[PDB]
Design an enzyme around this catalytic site. Structure first.
Site, PDB file in Angstrom:
ATOM      1  CG  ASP A 162    -117.035 -43.016-109.506  1.00 41.36           C
ATOM      2  OD1 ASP A 162    -117.627 -43.308-110.556  1.00 41.36           O
ATOM      3  OD2 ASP A 162    -115.812 -42.838-109.497  1.00 41.36           O
ATOM      4  CG  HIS A 166    -114.917 -46.906-109.407  1.00 39.81           C
ATOM      5  ND1 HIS A 166    -116.174 -47.015-109.952  1.00 39.81           N
ATOM      6  CD2 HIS A 166    -114.440 -45.706-109.804  1.00 39.81           C
ATOM      7  CE1 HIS A 166    -116.442 -45.928-110.654  1.00 39.81           C
ATOM      8  NE2 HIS A 166    -115.405 -45.118-110.582  1.00 39.81           N
ATOM      9  CG  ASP A 197    -116.916 -34.156-108.795  1.00 43.93           C
ATOM     10  OD1 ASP A 197    -117.310 -33.010-108.490  1.00 43.93           O
ATOM     11  OD2 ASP A 197    -115.713 -34.444-108.951  1.00 43.93           O
ATOM     12  NE  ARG A 198    -120.222 -36.670-114.064  1.00 40.47           N
ATOM     13  CZ  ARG A 198    -119.539 -37.623-114.691  1.00 40.47           C
ATOM     14  NH1 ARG A 198    -119.235 -38.750-114.064  1.00 40.47           N
ATOM     15  NH2 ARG A 198    -119.160 -37.452-115.949  1.00 40.47           N
ATOM     16  CG  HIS A 204    -121.237 -39.842-108.755  1.00 40.80           C
ATOM     17  ND1 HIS A 204    -119.888 -39.625-108.592  1.00 40.80           N
ATOM     18  CD2 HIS A 204    -121.370 -40.556-109.894  1.00 40.80           C
ATOM     19  CE1 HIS A 204    -119.234 -40.181-109.594  1.00 40.80           C
ATOM     20  NE2 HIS A 204    -120.110 -40.754-110.397  1.00 40.80           N
ATOM     21  CG  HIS A 245    -116.559 -46.442-113.845  1.00 41.34           C
ATOM     22  ND1 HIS A 245    -116.514 -45.264-113.129  1.00 41.34           N
ATOM     23  CD2 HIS A 245    -115.842 -46.233-114.971  1.00 41.34           C
ATOM     24  CE1 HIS A 245    -115.807 -44.380-113.806  1.00 41.34           C
ATOM     25  NE2 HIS A 245    -115.381 -44.944-114.921  1.00 41.34           N
ATOM     26  NE  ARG A 289    -115.816 -44.671-118.407  1.00 41.52           N
ATOM     27  CZ  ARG A 289    -116.910 -44.870-117.687  1.00 41.52           C
ATOM     28  NH1 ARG A 289    -117.325 -43.934-116.850  1.00 41.52           N
ATOM     29  NH2 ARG A 289    -117.580 -46.005-117.799  1.00 41.52           N
ATOM     30  CG  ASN A 348    -114.522 -43.000-111.600  1.00 37.44           C
ATOM     31  OD1 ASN A 348    -114.886 -44.177-111.610  1.00 37.44           O
ATOM     32  ND2 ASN A 348    -115.344 -42.008-111.323  1.00 37.44           N
ATOM     33  CG  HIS A 349    -115.613 -38.684-110.360  1.00 42.02           C
ATOM     34  ND1 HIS A 349    -116.890 -38.196-110.509  1.00 42.02           N
ATOM     35  CD2 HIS A 349    -115.169 -38.961-111.606  1.00 42.02           C
ATOM     36  CE1 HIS A 349    -117.205 -38.176-111.790  1.00 42.02           C
ATOM     37  NE2 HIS A 349    -116.177 -38.635-112.477  1.00 42.02           N
ATOM     38  CG  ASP A 365    -120.595 -44.111-109.589  1.00 40.67           C
ATOM     39  OD1 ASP A 365    -119.706 -44.603-110.317  1.00 40.67           O
ATOM     40  OD2 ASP A 365    -120.702 -42.884-109.430  1.00 40.67           O
TER      41      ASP A 365
HETATM   42 MN    MN Z   1    -119.490 -42.699-111.241  1.00 37.44          MN
END
Ligand code: MN
Lengths: 60, 554, 293, 21
Positions: free
Chosen positions: C84, C166, C87-88, C58, C240, C213, C116-117, C56
């Protein structure tokens, strides 16, 4: 609606389009090359002109 | 006619053409006559001036040299109206250039009358513009032997309190400059008024302006000791920080024992700027203080600081290294080194940095065995940033302290770095290896290092093989093609068969790199076969890099 | 026609290494090339012996730079990023641009997996849309990058015995043949095998479970054990969920989780970690902390 | 660039003509 006559007309018209389009591309490309050549020459001439102008300003 | 075309060029839309017109007022000055210049352009440059603020400033700058093309002193009056209209502008720097041009251009009786007029104009402005026109009128009257002495004193006294926090700050900060051109009696009365205003300084910026005035007084103005006592009382966080700002200038001048005491006290957020100023204070003390009076305050400040702050401590140590020989300095250095052993990394950074001044004091080769342990444990800590900084410092001290001194132990440290995991550490290691070989010669190199790395050239982790490749790449620059083609080249050609494609195309990279070092015959005989062989590979990257090597040299 | 755009790409990567983004036209041509490259990659990709797996990210671009500083530069070290990316984090655009630029340049030395993102919905919600707009005043970028995310391989298989992906694994999936038999050219559906590969995660409760989740499941130990044995894998690696240590060994050395974004959850203040598979497929981990700002 | 050059040249020659006056 798919069919062999349509596909053949499609390929013919599309190949013709690609060829005439590459032709227009080449003519426009040479045109733009010569155009920027002329405009760079004009910029160089104006540069020599400004040099001569400052020279005359110092002279007068 | 010239005024008209000036207006038209000044009516131009483009800022660049207008700026040319600005740079070309001398053209109109030479066009007209000096008498016609004064009679016409001065009314024009007085009334019709409206453009961009930057262009207004440019006009002021082009005007700053117009004390001559008007006709000299006998017409300075004719130059005063425009600058007045340019001393009242809302932008500070524009009226500042106006004051500069006034002081430049200022038969000065007409300038003095127009200076009283500019003081009247300042009476209208209830902001820093009042102080600006006041400082202008000061020099404008001084050009006439300060005939406006009482006027200058009254202007400074009014700027001391005129409901204009801007102008009040300007006065309470630069009375020493505004009342400088004023008469000596006027200057002294304004100095008394400035002491009164600094006492009247209530806000934080007021406290900074008061500290500035007190520093200017202690610099230029028992009266010295009385002003210094008043300043110290005003100095003992925000106001304390603004006073610590000038505390260094106070100590940078028996006339400073109280100042050094205040510096060691306030530092024992105000402490941050206090120690910042105390760096320079300690420099000035170690350069000027008397050893008898030094010892006590030095020991007190050392005990206090040893308890940003470490940076000031290192600065003070490097400064006090100006002492011929002080065992107390040796004890302080030992304590600071043991601290840098277990403290923030900046401690060790500053310590190894000032090790130059330490060796300059007595010779760090003596204390070598003292610092060596710290060094090694600084080379083997967790946070790779620290090990990286230690590596960066390593070659300095190594070449500083001779070959054999480090070759006993520190060579093991260079190796331990070369085998490390964190890539940045390996990179720093190779760079400083190049520095070491540059300083210690190819004899020591081939005798000590090159065998070790070429032994490293074989091990499982392909990173720990490309690192040897990079070491070779950076050694070839200085090791000379003889030793290269003797030892390096065989290993490179051999590694050119490693299974991992990364190793192979790095082989190609290093071959292209060290090519020019080598001999053309050696090239064509040895490397070109290997090069084409690599080009026959299947990995597209190694193919591309081998092709690059070919087309860059072969 | 070939080395010219290679030089162009190298210049792009160099520019990117200074937090200096690209023009939307550059991003467009880049995403076209990356689509062309990714279309030749199965849903379960194979990577040769030595690699460096990172999880991850991000959008923490400066921390990606720190990572590169830890584990080596781009072409020298083989990397494997398990999703991933964006984002964030503030520098989402720069992060994904750099990773894609690498993948296009050194298509053999780096492999990036879907996450996932990477679906239009999650980006539009969590911020990548907002940064695309702020930095570009458009959605053309966020369109290109999503139409590219719809091509990323779902999984990777290092030396035929390490399974990297992931998220985790799913009940609709029994063997790598099944994954390789999917259709990954679509947006992440809300329920399927895809919405579990990129959403599931191990846990303590054996067998399948319900993921708090909201998507995918929580495969217990026995699930992972039987999966490994039935596929010959020696270890399944994933990334993840936050792990403050940097990397966790769940299900008795069967599953590894490797978060590689330091100081992600600030209340926790994690340290990132990456895994190195050396010449002999022996894993060794490197834990690092956020860069000095 | 051509426009800027032509503009500055026009301004210069205008100032020169003003000198002529
Ligand atoms: Mn993540």
């Amino acid at each position: 609606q798919y069919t062999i006559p349509g596909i053949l007309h499609y390929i013919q018209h599309e190949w013709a389009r690609f060829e005439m389009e590459r032709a227009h591309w080449e003519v426009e490309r040479a045109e733009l090359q010569a155009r920027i050549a002329f405009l760079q020459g004009e910029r160089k001439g104006q540069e020599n002109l400004k040099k001569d102008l400052v020279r005359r300003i110092k002279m007068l | 006619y010239p005024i008209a075309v000036l207006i038209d060029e000044l009516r131009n839309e483009d800022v660049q053409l207008r700026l040319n017109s600005i740079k070309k007022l001398s053209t109109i000055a030479l066009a007209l006559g000096v008498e016609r210049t004064r009679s016409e352009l001065l009314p024009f440059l007085t009334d019709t001036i409206y453009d961009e603020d930057e262009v207004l400033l440019a006009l002021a700058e082009q005007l700053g040299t117009f004390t001559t093309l008007v006709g000299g002193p006998e017409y300075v009056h004719c130059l005063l109206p425009p600058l007045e209209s340019l001393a009242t502008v809302e932008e500070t720097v524009v009226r500042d250039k106006a004051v500069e041009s006034l002081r430049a251009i200022s038969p000065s009786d007409l300038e003095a009358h127009f200076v009283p007029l500019v003081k009247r104009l300042a009476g209208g402005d209830w902001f820093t513009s009042r102080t600006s026109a006041c400082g202008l009128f000061s020099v404008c009257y001084p050009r006439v032997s300060s005939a406006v002495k009482a006027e200058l004193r009254q202007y400074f006294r009014n700027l001391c309190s005129d409901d204009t926090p801007m102008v009040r700050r300007a006065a309470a900060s630069k009375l020493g400059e505004f009342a400088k051109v004023l008469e000596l009696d006027n200057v002294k009365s304004e100095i008394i008024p400035m002491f009164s205003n600094l006492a009247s300084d209530e806000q934080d910026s007021v406290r900074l302006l008061a500290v500035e005035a007190c520093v200017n007084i202690a610099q230029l103005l028992d009266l010295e000791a009385l002003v210094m006592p008043t300043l110290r009382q005003a100095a003992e966080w925000r106001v304390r920080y603004m006073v610590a700002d000038k505390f260094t200038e106070l100590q940078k001048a028996i006339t400073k024992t109280d100042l050094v005491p205040a510096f060691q006290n306030l530092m024992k957020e105000v402490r941050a700027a206090a120690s910042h100023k105390v760096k320079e204070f300690c420099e000035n003390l170690s350069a000027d203080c008397r050893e008898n009076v030094i010892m006590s305050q030095i020991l007190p400040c050392i005990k206090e600081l040893v308890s940003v702050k470490s940076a000031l401590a290192s600065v003070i140590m490097g400064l006090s290294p100006i002492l011929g020989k002080d065992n107390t300095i040796e004890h302080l250095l030992p304590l600071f080194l043991a601290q840098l052993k277990d403290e923030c990394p900046e401690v060790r950074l500053n310590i190894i940095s000032n090790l130059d001044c330490v060796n300059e004091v007595i010779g760090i080769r003596q204390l070598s065995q003292s610092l060596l342990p710290a060094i090694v444990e600084l080379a083997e800590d967790a946070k790779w940033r620290v090990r990286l900084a230690i590596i960066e410092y390593m070659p300095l001290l190594a070449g500083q302290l001779g070959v054999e001194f480090f070759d006993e132990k520190l060579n093991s440290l260079c190796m331990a770095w070369l085998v490390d995991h964190v890539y940045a550490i390996r990179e720093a290691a190779t760079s400083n290896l190049k520095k070491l070989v540059e300083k210690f010669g190819k004899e020591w190199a081939h005798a000590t290092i090159i065998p070790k790395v070429l032994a490293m050239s074989g091990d499982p982790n392909y990173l720990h093989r490309m690192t040897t490749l990079f070491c070779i790449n950076v050694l070839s620059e200085v090791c000379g093609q003889d030793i290269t083609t003797k030892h390096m080249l065989p290993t490179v050609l051999r590694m050119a068969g490693d299974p991992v494609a990364n190793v192979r195309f790095n082989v190609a990279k290093s071959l292209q790199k060290i090519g020019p070092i080598l001999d053309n015959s050696t090239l064509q005989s040895e490397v070109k076969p290997i090069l084409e062989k690599l080009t026959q590979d299947q990995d597209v990257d190694v193919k591309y890099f081998a092709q690059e090597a070919l087309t860059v040299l072969s | 026609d070939e080395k010219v755009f290679t030089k162009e790409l190298d210049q792009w990567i160099e520019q990117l290494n200074e937090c200096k983004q690209l023009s939307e036209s550059q991003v467009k041509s880049l995403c076209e090339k990356a689509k062309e490259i990714l279309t030749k990659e199965s849903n379960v990709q194979e990577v040769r012996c030595p690699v460096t797996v990172c999880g991850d990210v991000h959008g923490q671009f400066h921390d990606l730079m720190e990572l590169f500083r830890i584990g080596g530069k781009s072409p020298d070290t083989n990397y494997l990023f398990m999703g991933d990316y964006v984002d964030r984090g503030y520098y989402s655009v720069e992060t994904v641009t750099l990773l894609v630029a690498l993948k296009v340049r050194y298509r053999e030395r780096i492999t990036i997996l879907r996450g996932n993102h990477e679906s239009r919905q999650i980006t539009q919600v969590y911020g990548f849309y907002d940064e695309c707009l702020r930095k570009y005043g458009n959605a053309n970028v966020w369109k290109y990058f999503t139409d590219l995310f719809d091509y990323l391989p779902l999984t990777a298989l290092v030396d035929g015995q390490i399974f990297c992906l992931h998220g985790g694994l799913s009940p609709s999936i029994d063997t790598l043949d099944h994954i390789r038999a999917l259709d990954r050219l679509q947006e992440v559906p809300h329920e399927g095998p895809m919405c579990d590969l990129l959403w599931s995660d191990p846990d303590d409760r054996g067998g399948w479970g319900i993921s708090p989740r909201g998507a995918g499941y929580t495969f217990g130990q026995d699930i992972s054990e039987t999966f490994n044995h039935a596929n010959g894998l020696t270890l399944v690696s994933r990334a993840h969920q936050l792990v403050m240590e940097g990397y966790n060994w769940c299900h008795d050395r069967n599953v590894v989780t490797i978060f590689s974004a330091p100081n992600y959850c600030y209340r926790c203040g994690n340290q990132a970690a990456i895994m190195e598979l050396d010449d002999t497929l022996k894993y060794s981990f490197l834990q690092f902390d956020p860069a000095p700002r | 660039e051509r426009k800027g050059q032509e503009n500055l040249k026009k301004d210069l020659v205008r100032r020169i003509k003003m000198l002529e006056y």
